[PDB]
Ligand SMILES: NS(=O)(=O)c1ccc(C(=O)N2CCN(Cc3ccccc3)C2)cc1
């Protein structure tokens with residue numbers, strides 16, 4: 001029964017998921033003056049040429065674009081990571097208004113939305129084993145600002161009418177996630193968590209500095225989705241973001257000067 005309402009929102013999650021108040025929770029504010037350049041970080045390696053998208057699912061919290069992760073097809077390596085992380089899904093978090101929606105913030109600035117490309121460490125064999133490890137997942141986070149349309153996002157926007165409500169899915173093959181990346185792979189990185197229940201502390205966060213631009217019409221179509229199931233009272237899927245959590249004993253590292 002967790003969600004993003006007044007009665008079941010992020011301030012309530014700790015009652016069923018006490019790790020909500022833990023030492024490495026996400027998201028966080030990225031203070032750009034306190035993040036230190038780490039010359040030992042490697043360039044990110046984003047290898048998405050062989051990505052196999054399968055399906056898009058409205059899960060009642062967001063929509064997920066799911067990939068075939070039964071082989072090393074779309075992988076994230078390098079940067080702060082040891083070994084190979086396989087892409088399993090991507091999703092977004094967004095606002096009711098353009099002035100909010102991102103989960104990470106930059107010097108307390110909120111973006112209109114945030115893309116999460118979720119990857120799991122292949123040394124743990126499957127995603128369910130990986131989420132039980134402190135280095136199990138790598139999530140690539142990309143901010144969205146409202147301005148020019150993102151052409152590589154339109155195939156996602158155009159299928160959302162077919163998955164309006166919770167539990168609906170649609171075939172979503174041959175989608176190329178390279179079309180969601182910005183030009184620069186400059187990033188910030190820190191150890192954190194899933195941002196939704198069960199809030200497991202299993203994520204290496206890699207947040208790109210350069211946002212992508214999407215149009216007002218693209219993000220308006222995200223905000224026509226529903227949290228509810230078919231035939232239930234309509235509750236628009238908006239403001240599906242967790243706010244920034246305490247940094248505690250953590251350092252955010254920059255890949256760039
Ligand atoms: N916003 S985010 O990128 O941090 C993100 C949040 C949640 C998830 C996610 O995979 N969850 C659904 C399953 N659960 C994991 C799970 C638990 C037990 C058994 C198996 C799996 C969470 C992935 C990324």
Ligand SMILES: [Zn+2]
Pocket residue numbers: 091092093116195
């Ligand atoms: Zn997310």
